[PDB]
Every structure is written in structure tokens, then in C-alpha cells.
Design a protein around this nucleic acid. Structure first.
Lengths: 150, 50, 72, 50
RNA sequence: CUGUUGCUUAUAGACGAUGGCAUCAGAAAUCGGUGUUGUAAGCCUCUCGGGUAUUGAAUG
RNA sequence: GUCAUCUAAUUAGUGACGCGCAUGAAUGGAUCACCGUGAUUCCCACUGUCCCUAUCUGCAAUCUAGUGAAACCACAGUCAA
RNA sequence: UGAAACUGUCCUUAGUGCAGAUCUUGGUGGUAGUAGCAAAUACUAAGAAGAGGAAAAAAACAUCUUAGAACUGAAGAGGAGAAAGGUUCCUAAACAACAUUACUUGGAUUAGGGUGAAUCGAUCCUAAAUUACAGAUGGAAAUCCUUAAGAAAAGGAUUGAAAGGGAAUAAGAUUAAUAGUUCUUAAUCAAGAGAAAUGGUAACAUAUCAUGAACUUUAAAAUGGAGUGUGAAAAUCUACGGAAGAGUUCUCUUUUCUUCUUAACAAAAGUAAAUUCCACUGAAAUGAAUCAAUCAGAGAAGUGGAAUUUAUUGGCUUUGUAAGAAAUUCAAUGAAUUGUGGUAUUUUUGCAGUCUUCAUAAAAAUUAAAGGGAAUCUUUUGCUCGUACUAAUAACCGCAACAGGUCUCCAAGAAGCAAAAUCUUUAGUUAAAUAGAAUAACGCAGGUAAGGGAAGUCGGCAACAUAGCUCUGUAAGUUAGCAAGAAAGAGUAGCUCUGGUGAUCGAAUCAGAACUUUAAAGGUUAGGGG
RNA sequence: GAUUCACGCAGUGUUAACGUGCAAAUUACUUGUCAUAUUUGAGUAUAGGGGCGAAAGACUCAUCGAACUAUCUAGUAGCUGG
């Protein structure tokens, strides 16, 4: 006998594919009489039809690769296949820096460290690529504040 | 896989009567795993127990 | 590619069934029938088509009313 | 197509109805020569062209 | 007597053919010799280790 | 075509010469940067293209079971004169 | 042999004699049991059913289940549609023919069954265009005109889109097969029935409220593309805390894996991003701000407000629906659970400004508002038609189960700049013009090779070769833009560390230093140069 | 109307395969191209001394230096065959 109908109906009832349907190989005559979805539901209850577990796929190798890359184990020149701008965009570096530096100047003016006149000049200096990072801007502000206070 | 098979395989094949027709026999080849193949020769396995 | 390949895109009907003559001869874009000469009031017949005249003419059908009038 | 006109569907149904063979009792009539319907077709053999 | 057949047969070979043996036959593992690679797995040392080795290799 | 150059060797290539069978100015003449699945010549590198072939794999071809066409066909099918 | 018509002689009459016409039609040979049934990686074991794996190996055996081993690799050999087909859909019986062997299989034979809508479409509107009455034209057939010619149509007729516009439905379950269509629950829409208001300075706001005719106007439906930034959702990845189940386990692994969900339509605890307006004040020592810009006395910034957009009400969390569903487990129908986050990537969907055009990138049905001031909650109904199936290495077009052709939707992990090549998960499949033995020549496809290195050849044809990334360096010529990745040179692995780049814990990226080795892009991918 | 890779598409070479083929034009590799003079569906418009053509006498249903189909038509043949 052929259990093609039972495999198709069981996959619909169990909401899986035909590849996950397990029909009991010793109870073939019992399953053969299950020609309806209602009968298939009874067989599933009696464990004559079982949904196979999904194929195991682990991420252990990927996790250890990323942790090694965090320490820099595979970030060498022989492991880079994309250009410098492709790996780390040059535009997003600029966008991050302007948000970072404009945030700091905004905080200094609001708190009263710098007035609007000194804020305005530093805003244009920052825009003109004068400071590489946050620290370089802080020292220049403090250097200018001391010069003004003299 | 389909491309590689073990160089040496130890098998045990027994001849038993066919249940249906008594005159005929049939051979059942089964696989016996071994730790190593050193000093293993052809034998005859006999139960000889109650 | 003018042979086997170019025939793959043939899935748009030039002609559908005609209401007056029943043949798949109604040109959709021309809006007329190539066989019976539809909306034209007169049925389309030509003297060079002598076979087409004996395929659809008087007596080739049921003759529902005329079979009684003539015999009367 | 799934989408079709009503009268076109009825002409499709008629072509299904006409794709049938001679009934058995008709074949047992005296002086009968009609055993197989020669106006028969199948979807994969001849396209009915409508 | 010859042929078939068997040794999933070779000193032979597309198939035939040809050559050998056919119960003191043949086949098989195992062991030894002989080679190749390079020092196995558990705990630099075990370690000239481990693995392979007729399949068209040679003994028993 | 003649003279140079390219090679050991040049009916090929390039640079000159020009009474040019029969070049020539929107029949457009000359010029050429960049570009070209365009044409041509020479270098470097590389290699079975070659010296000169050897060898490895898969699928066929061989044989067998099942299945099974076509082209062609006067009759046919050894040579010398 | 054959079983019902026929013959001889004389005249008359002719569709009157075949070896040829590449003659016409039909039938049949040799070739010949020959060429072939060789693209699409691939099958094996046990069992069942069946007449159909027998046997001195006749070395191969179709269908179904299970186990193993595998392929397509999520721009698929996955899940669905448009056209086209037309019952091929589902089931049962049955296998004469058909699918280049066979078939118990089938898109094949026979007989039954199957397509359910107020909300999806057609129907409705118009686009390019198309066609009428009257009129104009023509010998005629007929052509022209489509609002101009008209005693026709307040203004102009018909048709034209299952991708354009458009009133309104979702979740779960269910069937051998249909399901935004059936059932349960919960909604929505249309058409019906039962002297005319307030608040706010303002922008504007009030579960119908709070009248609003003719006429007119405005807006919507309804409008290119590029590129940048960014809000939200989903998927993927990940942090914290677990609950339940499964995998490995004599070697370890507080371990690896799986589930932890929720609709339409509404509500309004809490809380966003962007833009545009309003009130106060009036900016020069000019300020404000963006990745970029851009803006300001026809009024900036600041403070306080109003509105709209963000895949239904109002964007997100949350709430009703609603856990009673569903998912994952356990017991033999009954019980358990169903937190909180992320300055990560991609897709989708909006938004904001920038750029570009000798290109400026539909209309109508239909809807709302305004100006004007004429007049004085419950319940009913919702018609017609399509709806099955394939949508393609077998349902379509090519004579066919043809390696050809044919418009779309959704879209996991690794690795990488990459939707590249390669491998895998969910799903699908292991059959897709037959195989077994042998391992000749000559082939087709893929390779390698001593020494030499184009001497081969019409010709470096074919093949080899170069190839990613970083740093240094880069000539003549030039339309000054390029040539340019010119050319040329050095570096690159593994392990253990350090430093730089932020916010009030996190991102992969860059630089440097020890030590070790078979001294490192090269498995795949990947310029030869002058 | 810059350079490239990918999904797709084409057709430079092998003058490879096949050439009674998978195919009355396809397959493999190499190569080229791969969004604005781009690609593509459906609707629609243009018809045979005509259409359409970034122009090859190209394309107009395997038919094009004048389509297909039917009639005149059993066209005529000093030429070939019987």
C-alpha cells in the first residue's frame, strides 16, 4: 500500500513539511485506514505519526570567531578583502565626529563655559577639520579660555 | 559517504533456514566492530549454550 | 532566434469567438469578424471563396422555419 | 485563466461534457457501428482552440 | 578426446581468441620480508612512531 | 619603389623621399588627448603551440539484457593493362 | 482454393493494353537487432504490497514506509499570482495503449467528487485610442467628422485598464480538494426606517451637535529621477533572567539546540522624531544651526504654545478584541508557562531638506471645504459574474514530459566590499530520453609534465600567465579634465598583548609590539603589462 | 549619457560541442554589457509599390530585392522528362 495521502495530510495537520513527517513503519495497516484529516488527528494523538525535530545547527564556531576578532586575532592585512573605505566608511567617521564635537560645544555654551561669540568661532573651526577627536577640542577651548581671562 | 569506504571491514555472516520454505537457506551478513585488525583470522562462531 | 525561441511569448489572443458566426474570428483590435464580416449588416461572402460559401449558407444549418414554409 | 466571462465558462463546460465515450448499452444496439467517439480530445494532445 | 563452466584467472585481452590451474584446486585473512609518508591518539618523552602497502609486488 | 631602423636573416612594421597608373580640401584636407569584445607590428612575462610526446580522471565507444530508428539502395561489390 | 454469377461468335462503342515520367496513392524490404535510449553530482539497506529477483551472481529490480547518504542553497529544483491551458485538481478501481527499459507509478484508462464573497476582483471612471444618429464626401463599396456642420447630444454621444483611479473583513479552525468566500468570534461600509452654539490674544479646539438652497470658487483623487541624513516596524545578531523539551557525554562542556506569539477595528496610562505656524522680545561684538546645506528687522536665537506626518483609530510601549486562540511540554480530556533590554546589520515604510532637466514628469468618476444667504441609539437590506489546478528541467508557446522562450510577489546562517563563487538551515527533491560487466583504439569534457621557451602557425588560435587589500611610487603625451589600477617595489599567517577613535555600558575599525611556524590574498573569487 | 562587480541580457573567440542535434540556430567555456539614447509587461496606433527602419534591403507570425491566402488558372513554354 502507498501512504502518499497520509504523508500529505499529516504535514498539513502538523504544520510541517513532508520531510518532517514520521509515519510509524510497523503500523502501516493502521495508518492506511486513516484516509481523512480527522483520522490523522487521532493517529497523531496516539503517537503513530510524529513530527521530527529540526536539524540541529549550532553557532558555537561563529561565536568563538567573533570573540577572537574582538581581541583582534583575525584582523590582519592578509584577511582584508575590501578597500579601506568599504570596511570603514570615511563619510560616517566624519558624521560621527561632527555630532560628537557639536554636542560638546553646545554643552559648553549652555552651561556658561563659553559665550556665543567664542562658540561661533569654534563652530567654524570644528567644521574646518581642525580637531581630530574630543580631547583636541577640549584643550583648545581651555587654552583659549585662559588667554581670554588674562 | 559515497566516495570513501573503510579499508578493512569485519563482517559476520550466518546461514539460517528460511522460515517459509524449509528446504532453502539464507545468509545474514552483519557488522562486528573491532578495535584493531591485528591478528584476526577467519573463525567459526558457535553458541553451544542452553 | 526567429524560429523556436521567438514562439515563447505567444500568450495574447488576436481573435476570440464571434457572436454571429461562432468562429474564433473576431479580431479584438479591429473590432470586426474575419469570417462572417460582423457588425457589417450583410454576411461576408466572396465569389473567389466558393468553398467558404458551401461551408456556411442556407441549408447548412437547422432551417427551423424555412423547412416548414417551403413544404407548405 | 481563473478570470473568465460567464458565457466563455459555459462553453468550457460543454467541451468537458462532449469529451466522453459511447455508453455500454449503446454499443449493444443491433446494427451498431459506433464503438469509439472520434471527436474526442485530451488537454495534452490537441488544443481546442478557443 | 574436445568444447562449455569455475578460479569476479593471468605473462593475454574491444568481444572472440591466447596462456595457466581446476580437490595435493582455488580463495581468504593473519604473520614475516619489502616499500611510501614523516613521528599517531591518551597522558620535549613515550615514538625509526602511527598509517598504507597489490590493487597488476614477493613468502609462509 | 629608394634610403635608414627593427632581426642572425624582413614581400611584414615604423621614419623619411615623391611627376602621385589614379591624393587633396564640408565627395571635406591635416591633426589626433581619452575611449574601442575594431585592424596592424614589435618587446617583457608565461606557457604542450612546438622540439616530441607521455600520462591521469569522468562520460561514451566494446560486450550484454530490454527497447530500437534514419540517410541511401539499377544489379552489385578483388586487381593490372 | 473459392461459393453466385458467367462465357463463346458477329457487329457497335471506348475513361481500352505500362517498367520507367524525383510519376500519384497504398503497402513492404536491405541497411539492421545496427546508430542510438551518455547534459541536469546518487544512490544504499530492511520491511510492505504485487503475477512480476529470479540465479550455477541472471552483479541491474518500478511504488510506499523507515534508516543511512545526498542535491537545489533561499535573485531556489521553496511558497503564490497575471496571461495561456481547460478539469490536467481530489479520491477509488483498474495498467490494453502512452511517458526511447519496466512500472504495482503518472499530468495516462474508467467512474465519481470538487470552485460558496455586501468587504477580493470584474461591474463603475477615464488614458493612449475607438465607434454611432444627423451632416459632409463618393460611380460604388464605403470614407470623413466625434462636437464641428444639427430644432440632436445644464453642456455634450459609445467603447477603451482583472498592473492606472476606486465605499467597506480580520484572527483562529475546518476539507480527500474551496476559502480575505465556509464555520466561530469580533468589525466595517452603503442605502434606507424608527432668526440658527461656545472656548483660546493667536496659531486653533470642542462622543452629530451648534440649520444652511440656487450660484461660484478652492482643495483632494493626482504625479519624474538621483543622492544624503534620519524616525518606526520586521528579520538577523546579541545582553540580562529563566520555564519546558531535545542532542553529546567516559574526555570535557553551569553546555549546544527548539518554543516563549497574537489580527482587523477601536482606546488613550506613559512617551517620541521631523516639519510648519502662533504669542513675548527685538539680533552687529552678527548670530543660529546641518552629513551637506540653509536661515534671519517682509524678523533670527531664547521662552511658552498650536497643528500635521510617522504601514488603523493617534508614531511607539500599553489597553479592549484576548487567551477562552495559538505555540511548547506533561498526564490520562485535564493541567503548566508565554520578562526586560541593544549608541549592531539588512529589508520595508515614511519624513526632511540638496541636486537635475532646451525632460517639469495623466484624466475622470467621486469627495470635502469655503463665499452667499434662499427657506423656516435600535433595526432592515446588500443583486449578477470569476473563484478548482499548473504557472513551468512535465499542465503555457515551440509537432513532445523539447537543455529554447515566457511578466511579477516573499526571502535564513557562515564568509566577504559584495544579492559574487563555496557550504549549510526551513521547504522541495533523490525521479527527471534504461542499466550491468569490462577498463582496447579513436573521441568529448577536465588536468599535469623533465630541458628549451613561439623555433609551431596565416596569425600566441588554444592554453599558460596577472589577479584581493595596505604602503611607497608612477613617464611621455594632453582638449589640462586625464593618461593611472600607468609602469615599478615592499608588506599580508597563527598566538599573547598594548594603544587610538564614544555615551551617562557599547561599535567594529585602525595602528603598534613580543613569540612561533610548513614565512601566510589565492580553497573559492580575483586586471597580464609595455 | 564617468569606471567596475552582481541579478539579468547579448553573442567577441574557441572558427569548441552538436550538426539524421536538447534545439528548423541550441550548449559549454572565454568575452562583452549590465538604468536615463537603460530593461521590460499589458493596452493601443501604423498594412502590402503599403507599413516600420540610429539604414543591414533590415523587419512585417520559421514566408520579404515586395507577406500570407483564394480566384483568373489546367497562365505560357521553340525547353527537360514520360
Amino acid at each position: 500500500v502507498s501512504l502518499k495521502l497520509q504523508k500529505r495530510l499529516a504535514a498539513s495537520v502538523l504544520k510541517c513539511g513532508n520531510r518532517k513527517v514520521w509515519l510509524d513503519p510497523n503500523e502501516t495497516p493502521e495508518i492506511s485506514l486513516a484516509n481523512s484529516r480527522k483520522a490523522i488527528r487521532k493517529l497523531i494523538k496516539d503517537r503513530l505519526i510524529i513530527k521530527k525535530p529540526a536539524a540541529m545547527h549550532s553557532r558555537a564556531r561563529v561565536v568563538e570567531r567573533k570573540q577572537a576578532k574582538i581581541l583582534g586575532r583575525h584582523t590582519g592585512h592578509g584577511k582584508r578583502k575590501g578597500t579601506k573605505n568599504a570596511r570603514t566608511p570615511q563619510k560616517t567617521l566624519w558624521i560621527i565626529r561632527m555630532r560628537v564635537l557639536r554636542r560638546l560645544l553646545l554643552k559648553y555654551r549652555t552651561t556658561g563655559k563659553i559665550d556665543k561669540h567664542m562658540y561661533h568661532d569654534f563652530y567654524l573651526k570644528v567644521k574646518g577639520n581642525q580637531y581630530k577627536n574630543k580631547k583636541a577640542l577640549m584643550e583648545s577651548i581651555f587654552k583659549a579660555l585662559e588667554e581670554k581671562k588674562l | 559517504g559515497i566516495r570513501s569506504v573503510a579499508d578493512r571491514i569485519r563482517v559476520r555472516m550466518a546461514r539460517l533456514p528460511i522460515e517459509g520454505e524449509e528446504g532453502k537457506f539464507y545468509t545474514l551478513v552483519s557488522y562486528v566492530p573491532v578495535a584493531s585488525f591485528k591478528g584476526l583470522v577467519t573463525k567459526t562462531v558457535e553458541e553451544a549454550e542452553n | 532566434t526567429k524560429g523556436t525561441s521567438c514562439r515563447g511569448t505567444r500568450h495574447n489572443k488576436t481573435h476570440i469567438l464571434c457572436k454571429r458566426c461562432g468562429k474564433r474570428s473576431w479580431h479584438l483590435q479591429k473590432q470586426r469578424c474575419a469570417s462572417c464580416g460582423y457588425p457589417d449588416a450583410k454576411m461576408r461572402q466572396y465569389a473567389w471563396g466558393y468553398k467558404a460559401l458551401r461551408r456556411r449558407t442556407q441549408g447548412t444549418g437547422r432551417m427551423r422555419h424555412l423547412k416548414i414554409a417551403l413544404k407548405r | 485563466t481563473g478570470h473568465k466571462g460567464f458565457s466563455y465558462k459555459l462553453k468550457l463546460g460543454k467541451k468537458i461534457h462532449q469529451n466522453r465515450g459511447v455508453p455500454q448499452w449503446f454499443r449493444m444496439k443491433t446494427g451498431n457501428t459506433i464503438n469509439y467517439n472520434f471527436k474526442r480530445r485530451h488537454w495534452n494532445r490537441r488544443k481546442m482552440g478557443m
